[PDB]
Amino acid sequence: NPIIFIIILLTIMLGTIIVMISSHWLLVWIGFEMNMLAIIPIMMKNHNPRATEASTKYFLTQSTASMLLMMAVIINLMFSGQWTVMKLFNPMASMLMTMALAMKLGMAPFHFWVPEVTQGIPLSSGLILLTWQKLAPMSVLYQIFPSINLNLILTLSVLSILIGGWGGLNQTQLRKIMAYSSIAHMGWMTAVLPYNPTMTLLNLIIYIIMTSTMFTMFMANSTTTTLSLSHTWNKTPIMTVLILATLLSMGGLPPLSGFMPKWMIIQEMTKNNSIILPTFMAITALLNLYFYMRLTYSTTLTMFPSTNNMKMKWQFPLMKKMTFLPTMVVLSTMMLPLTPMLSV
Amino acid sequence: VELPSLEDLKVQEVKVSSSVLKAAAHHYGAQCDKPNKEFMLCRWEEKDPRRCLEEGKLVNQCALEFFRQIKRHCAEPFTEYWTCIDYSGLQLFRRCRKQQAQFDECVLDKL
Amino acid sequence: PFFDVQKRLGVDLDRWMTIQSAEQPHKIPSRCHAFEKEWIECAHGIGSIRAEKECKIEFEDFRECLLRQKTMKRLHAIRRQREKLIKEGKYTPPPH
Amino acid sequence: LLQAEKDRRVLQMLRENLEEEATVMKDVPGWKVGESVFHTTRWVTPMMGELYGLRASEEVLSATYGFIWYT
Amino acid sequence: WFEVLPGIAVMGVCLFIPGMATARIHRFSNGGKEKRVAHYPYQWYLMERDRRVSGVNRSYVSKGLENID
Amino acid sequence: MFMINILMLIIPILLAVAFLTLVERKVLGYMQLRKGPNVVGPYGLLQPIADAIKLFIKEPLRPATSSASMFILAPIMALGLALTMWIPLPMPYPLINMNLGVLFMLAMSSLAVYSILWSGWASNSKYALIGALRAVAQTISYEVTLAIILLSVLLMSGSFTLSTLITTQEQMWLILPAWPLAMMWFISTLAETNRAPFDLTEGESELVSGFNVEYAAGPFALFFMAEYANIIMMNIFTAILFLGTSHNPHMPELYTINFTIKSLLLTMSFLWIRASYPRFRYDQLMHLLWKNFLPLTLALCMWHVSLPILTSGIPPQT
Amino acid sequence: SMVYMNIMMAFTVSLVGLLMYRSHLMSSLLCLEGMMLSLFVMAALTILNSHFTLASMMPIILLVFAACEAALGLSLLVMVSNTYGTDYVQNLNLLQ
Amino acid sequence: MMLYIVFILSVIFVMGFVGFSSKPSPIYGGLGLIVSGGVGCGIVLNFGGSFLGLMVFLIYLGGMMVVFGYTTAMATEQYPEIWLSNKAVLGAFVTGLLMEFFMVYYVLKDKEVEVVFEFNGLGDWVIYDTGDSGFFSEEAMGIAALYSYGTWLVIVTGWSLLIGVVVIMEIT
Amino acid sequence: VAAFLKNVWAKEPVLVASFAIAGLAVILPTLSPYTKYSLMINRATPYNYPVPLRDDGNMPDVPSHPQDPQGPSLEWLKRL
Amino acid sequence: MNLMLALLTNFTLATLLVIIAFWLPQLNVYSEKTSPYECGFDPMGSARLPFSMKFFLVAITFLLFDLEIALLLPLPWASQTANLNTMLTMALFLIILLAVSLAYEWTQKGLE
Numbered sequence A: 001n002p003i004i005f006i007i008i009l010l011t012i013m014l015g016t017i018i019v020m021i022s023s024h025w026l027l028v029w030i031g032f033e034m035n036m037l038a039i040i041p042i043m044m045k046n047h048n049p050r051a052t053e054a055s056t057k058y059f060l061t062q063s064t065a066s067m068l069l070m071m072a073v074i075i076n077l078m079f080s081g082q083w084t085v086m087k088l089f090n091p092m093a094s095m096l097m098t099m100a101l102a103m104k105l106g107m108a109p110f111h112f113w114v115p116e117v118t119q120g121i122p123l124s125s126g127l128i129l130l131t132w133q134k135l136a137p138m139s140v141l142y143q144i145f146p147s148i149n150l151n152l153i154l155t156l157s158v159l160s161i162l163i164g165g166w167g168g169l170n171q172t173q174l175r176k177i178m179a180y181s182s183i184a185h186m187g188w189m190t191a192v193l194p195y196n197p198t199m200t201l202l203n204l205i206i207y208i209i210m211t212s213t214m215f216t217m218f219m220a221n222s223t224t225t226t227l228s229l230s231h232t233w234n235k236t237p238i239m240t241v242l243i244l245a246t247l248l249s250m251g252g253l254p255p256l257s258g259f260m261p262k263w264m265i266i267q268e269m270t271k272n273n274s275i276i277l278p279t280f281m282a283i284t285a286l287l288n289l290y291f292y293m294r295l296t297y298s299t300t301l302t303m304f305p306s307t308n309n310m311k312m313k314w315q316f317p318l319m320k321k322m323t324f325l326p327t328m329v330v331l332s333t334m335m336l337p338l339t340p341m342l343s344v
Numbered sequence B: 001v002e003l004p005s006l007e008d009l010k011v012q013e014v015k016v017s018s019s020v021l022k023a024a025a026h027h028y029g030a031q032c033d034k035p036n037k038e039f040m041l042c043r044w045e046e047k048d049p050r051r052c053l054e055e056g057k058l059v060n061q062c063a064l065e066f067f068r069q070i071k072r073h074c075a076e077p078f079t080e081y082w083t084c085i086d087y088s089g090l091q092l093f094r095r096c097r098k099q100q101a102q103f104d105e106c107v108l109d110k111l
Numbered sequence C: 001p002f003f004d005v006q007k008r009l010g011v012d013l014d015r016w017m018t019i020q021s022a023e024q025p026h027k028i029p030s031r032c033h034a035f036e037k038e039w040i041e042c043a044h045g046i047g048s049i050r051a052e053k054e055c056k057i058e059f060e061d062f063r064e065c066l067l068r069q070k071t072m073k074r075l076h077a078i079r080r081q082r083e084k085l086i087k088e089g090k091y092t093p094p095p096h
Numbered sequence D: 001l002l003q004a005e006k007d008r009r010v011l012q013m014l015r016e017n018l019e020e021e022a023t024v025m026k027d028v029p030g031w032k033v034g035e036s037v038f039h040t041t042r043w044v045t046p047m048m049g050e051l052y053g054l055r056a057s058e059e060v061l062s063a064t065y066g067f068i069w070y071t
Numbered sequence E: 001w002f003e004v005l006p007g008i009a010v011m012g013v014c015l016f017i018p019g020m021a022t023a024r025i026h027r028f029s030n031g032g033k034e035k036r037v038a039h040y041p042y043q044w045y046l047m048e049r050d051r052r053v054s055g056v057n058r059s060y061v062s063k064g065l066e067n068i069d
Numbered sequence F: 001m002f003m004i005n006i007l008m009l010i011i012p013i014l015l016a017v018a019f020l021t022l023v024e025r026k027v028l029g030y031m032q033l034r035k036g037p038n039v040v041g042p043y044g045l046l047q048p049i050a051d052a053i054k055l056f057i058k059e060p061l062r063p064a065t066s067s068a069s070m071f072i073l074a075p076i077m078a079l080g081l082a083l084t085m086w087i088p089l090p091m092p093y094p095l096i097n098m099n100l101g102v103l104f105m106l107a108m109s110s111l112a113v114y115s116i117l118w119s120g121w122a123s124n125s126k127y128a129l130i131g132a133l134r135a136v137a138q139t140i141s142y143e144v145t146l147a148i149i150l151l152s153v154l155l156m157s158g159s160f161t162l163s164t165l166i167t168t169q170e171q172m173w174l175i176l177p178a179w180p181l182a183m184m185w186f187i188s189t190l191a192e193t194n195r196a197p198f199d200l201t202e203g204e205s206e207l208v209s210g211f212n213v214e215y216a217a218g219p220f221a222l223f224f225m226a227e228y229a230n231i232i233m234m235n236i237f238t239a240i241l242f243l244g245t246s247h248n249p250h251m252p253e254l255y256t257i258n259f260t261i262k263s264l265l266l267t268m269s270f271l272w273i274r275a276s277y278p279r280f281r282y283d284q285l286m287h288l289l290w291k292n293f294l295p296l297t298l299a300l301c302m303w304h305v306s307l308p309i310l311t312s313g314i315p316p317q318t
Numbered sequence G: 001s002m003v004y005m006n007i008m009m010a011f012t013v014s015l016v017g018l019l020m021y022r023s024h025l026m027s028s029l030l031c032l033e034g035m036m037l038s039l040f041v042m043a044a045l046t047i048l049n050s051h052f053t054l055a056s057m058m059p060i061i062l063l064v065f066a067a068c069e070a071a072l073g074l075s076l077l078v079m080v081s082n083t084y085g086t087d088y089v090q091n092l093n094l095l096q
Numbered sequence H: 001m002m003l004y005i006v007f008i009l010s011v012i013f014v015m016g017f018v019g020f021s022s023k024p025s026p027i028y029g030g031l032g033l034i035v036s037g038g039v040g041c042g043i044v045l046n047f048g049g050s051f052l053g054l055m056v057f058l059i060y061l062g063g064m065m066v067v068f069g070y071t072t073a074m075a076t077e078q079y080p081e082i083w084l085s086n087k088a089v090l091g092a093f094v095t096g097l098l099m100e101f102f103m104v105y106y107v108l109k110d111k112e113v114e115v116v117f118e119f120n121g122l123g124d125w126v127i128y129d130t131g132d133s134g135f136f137s138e139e140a141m142g143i144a145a146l147y148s149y150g151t152w153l154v155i156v157t158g159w160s161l162l163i164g165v166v167v168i169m170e171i172t
Numbered sequence I: 001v002a003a004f005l006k007n008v009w010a011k012e013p014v015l016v017a018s019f020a021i022a023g024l025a026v027i028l029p030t031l032s033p034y035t036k037y038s039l040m041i042n043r044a045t046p047y048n049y050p051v052p053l054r055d056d057g058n059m060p061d062v063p064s065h066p067q068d069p070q071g072p073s074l075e076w077l078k079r080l
Numbered sequence J: 001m002n003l004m005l006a007l008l009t010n011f012t013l014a015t016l017l018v019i020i021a022f023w024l025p026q027l028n029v030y031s032e033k034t035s036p037y038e039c040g041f042d043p044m045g046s047a048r049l050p051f052s053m054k055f056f057l058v059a060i061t062f063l064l065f066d067l068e069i070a071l072l073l074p075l076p077w078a079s080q081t082a083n084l085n086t087m088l089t090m091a092l093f094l095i096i097l098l099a100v101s102l103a104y105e106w107t108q109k110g111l112e
């Protein structure tokens, strides 16, 4: 058992490396066709009657998601009959690309899914791996980038960062609260995308870090919000200053780095003299903050320590690379006008 | 578009079956090569087999006198030779091997 | 992000199956083959953003070599020059 | 030799499918005699519908489908 | 031991018909010459030619050398 | 008259599959020390005209509990893919010439078992229900033993057609060179078509009667005439794919004469077994295929691949 | 010409109410595993009527996963109806 | 046996689907496929591609479907039924069947109606061939065997299958 | 270890005949010099049609008449 | 054009012969009592067909070994090439990729 789990868990990125490296429409099929083939067993490990009524609601929702694509590959094999990877030469291709590809990322619609999977996968360990599948598709959209109907990729955006915002205010389980507001940050990076498509990646990396360092923190035992109350008077208080040094930075406030994507993105989205778009995005991520406040009023307010609960033992988890990230998830704003000229 | 008239057409096509046409067919081209390789170059080198019709009547011509040659000297061993190969399926060349000399007795020798 | 490793080092992953004219092992062509080497010759040193408003000629017929989209219509419109008048004279042809 | 027989068979074939077209009607909202559906000019092997017209009886059926389904 | 020798001779002959039927229909339909076979589109291309030049319509009648004199 | 060359085939064969049933119990008679159907003939050769007529007089019940829509389309098959498969089969002149046709058998060898799964399910419960399920399961695991060891030799002959396969066996009876394989070409067709030593599908011992149990005299002649339309064909195949005769562009007739005096010897093998060996108890039955038959069949494939390449041998085809 | 509008109307086999529903999941999963042949055949013509000669393998690779993968997702449909005995899409339990 | 023997297959094919694209009690689902698959492998056997057609029988229609049919005894439905008998299934059917029919009616029932359905002519198979040719194994997919140029195409498919079993050795 | 190799051959002498042929077909193609003949034959079979090149000056070899001295020796096979 | 003449000929003898056997005496005037006496020698048999697994895998287990011996199929056409080493080096991979896929699962067949 333990060897293969590193053979499987290696083949994933090999599934997404053929995606970013390829010239050829067939391979970007095979490429993220073998994720939906090689993801599935990870969900399983404890063999419960959710994961198996989960990965089957995932499966057939990434099965068609793929299988439409192959229909919008073979359209422009008719017209122009030249594969490769470039604008799609025909409008029924793209409109059948981008709004059937939004299924893997899920955007504004096509998410009754992201909460039905991320919730109740019995395996919370990760579930950090659902930051790969954000990274396979984008590595198409960066290439196809000069063909979109342009009235759409905004219309799935602006109906998203809204709909993923309101989704959570009503939520308690904190695997969902990350599930929600992970549709949100898919609102900023594909709203930009036709204007200057780098300063997207900028929001893509700053995102992979911040959501990454959450989970590694949410791993000790933590599950439900009211199990993060029994946290500071039990496990360690140096944990609580952390979970307050990020959850605030993730909606973002200018002295932190969470403010770094917006601050740069709007340099771009005006200067193109669209100033009536970004406020409504800029202003809607506001009530995206009221999850985190009211999440953060759980742990610093000393709320009814659990019960007589005596944990005298020390810890032996793997914090691996957590002792770094919230010095790069926070303090990087003072550093960089690199991100626009570094990855470019 | 410009197409030539109906003329320089209706020319003399060699009219023979597909069994006899493969009977000699072999001594045929190796010894001729006067128009034909050259006639390829009036196609491959420059395409549009419309601008080049001329050698087409030269290469078609070489055949005419060829089968007109053979009728004078020996048609008797030939007529019997392309009968066997015309006894049929696949038109093998390994059945008539015996008679191959009888046709080629004096052809390589006499003429 | 499209790294293009097969450019740096030597290997060919695909790059061969890619277009309509490359090799075809015994050297046999496609039907519209001859219009590729015409249309690629157009946009190469171009940066493709002016290509759309520059070449566009060598492309269109190429799209009309491929589907035969028009020649099939001017054809289907001979069925209206004849075969409404069949009774009205000029049977056309004489057989043979 | 074999080929120099064919090329003549199609050029003969277009002419009759033109000269016996242009004498069908000359219409004022008609077409010029033997225009080109393309802009470019060179010899491009014609489509089946070019050689055989709407004729479409039998010897066609033995041409396109002739080889397939049988000797 | 012998009584089975008749039992064969029914099944045996009944398989010696279908091999002699098709063999002698082809030889009969095309008049003495085994049926042509077209596997590859080149091979066909001579028959559908030879139909044109033969005498009228068929592929099984060869002209011969005196045809063109 | 191409339509009278066909109907001259379908009819004259239904006599063999009929008069096999007689030589069934004569040959298997003298293994037992006795004589075979005798009183009625006089020699017996007249038995099968009386047997074909008792069934269709005898009343054809249907179970009250059946689904009649499936209880027809299924047997309306067991007599097609048995009589279609005969089509492109050279003796010497096949009725059809199929370019790659050898592959076409596996197409029709694979599509018959989907007429077992219908019938046994079409009717009813556990003697034909799970009893027609687990004869599916053995019938598909004896293909992978097959298509490979059919594909082996075809490296040793060059193409997929059957007109080449008379040419290559000229003076070499293709059974020398791969005799290890040839064995497995035999135990397959005997295991796949449900015959003696692996008998389970049709029941005698392991169950009452497999898959035949419901059909009364009416339909059950078809199967009992279908199941014997496969057995004399695979065995009228093996001997075009191994023991070759020598074509004769002159006396075609002497080809078939010497050809039925082989394929008709060969067949009398599934009768010469059935007197002899017992059955396998379905575990041992598949359990002996993966473990045992298969590893070789792969291994030899790694061998007949290289042997041409390593001798400059490569057979003259595309 | 016409064979490109059939089969296309066939590739609206998706029809999605009958892609996830209603119960007997095996009917849903079925119209999926036959959503191919609308992808296959359609791409076994355009490749063929014009001689590409190279992409001709692609049709083969459109099955080799379409069988491999769609045969995976069958597996789960045992795990669902192992613990039940009826598939019946009407199991919702994990909610939101 | 006219020139329309292709157009008569597909419109049986297109009707091959709508049987199982609604809701037929999926022991008849198969019988909506093996007809569709059959006629499907039918259409492809024209055009000259042959080997690539005759495989769908071997690898899919013959081999795959049987697994689809070897289960639905394990998921086994309770007391199957002849489809279109019910009022739930029958209602959804025809409106599909007519929708191409009423399409196929005046798509061309006349000179042309109108534009979008008028640029497809019919009846000679105008495109269906070109000229003549030589022969390589045929010309086309006769050479479908590339263990030459194709390699990085195989070795993924070659490797992607090898993991197919490991995943399925577990959850099983 | 040879006692092992004789104590699996008293129990499962089956797959051993597969391994025995599993190798011994991998090894040998790198040995016998008959190979690489195999690659020369297979390159010289003219599937296509040779097209004559243009001769101005050189013309290294290969005159108009083919049977004249032209090019390499392929007749090492005819005697073979 | 004569293939379909050689197919619909074959079925039409078969699809005939069902009715002249099944149907013809089926309307005969004999008794044929409706009594629920049928379904021989397991008289009643009221159950669902239960899931029995080692019945199931022998479906899946095949389907995958099946695929690649479609991939493996065009060897004998590919034995005619230019550079052949990319064949023998490559051809022999599929096989060993097949045979490996055995050896793993071979730890557990169960009762197959």
Ligand SMILES: CCCCCCCCCCCCCCCCCC(=O)OC[C@H](COP(=O)(O)OCCN)OC(=O)CCCCCCCCCCCCCCCCC
Binding pocket: F182, F183, F292, F296, I011, I012, I013, I014, I015, I017, I020, I021, I024
């Ligand atoms: C350098 C070049 C290479 C050199 C290689 C050297 C030689 C290697 C080649 C040898 C391979 C031969 C064939 C493969 C071996 C035979 C198959 C086999 O392994 O059978 C093993 C079988 C297992 O039995 P066992 O392990 O003992 O377990 C039961 C214990 N109660 O034990 C058995 O006995 C099973 C016996 C077979 C089972 C069915 C028999 C039924 C009767 C059919 C026999 C008819 C076949 C005869 C062939 C006819 C050919 C025309």
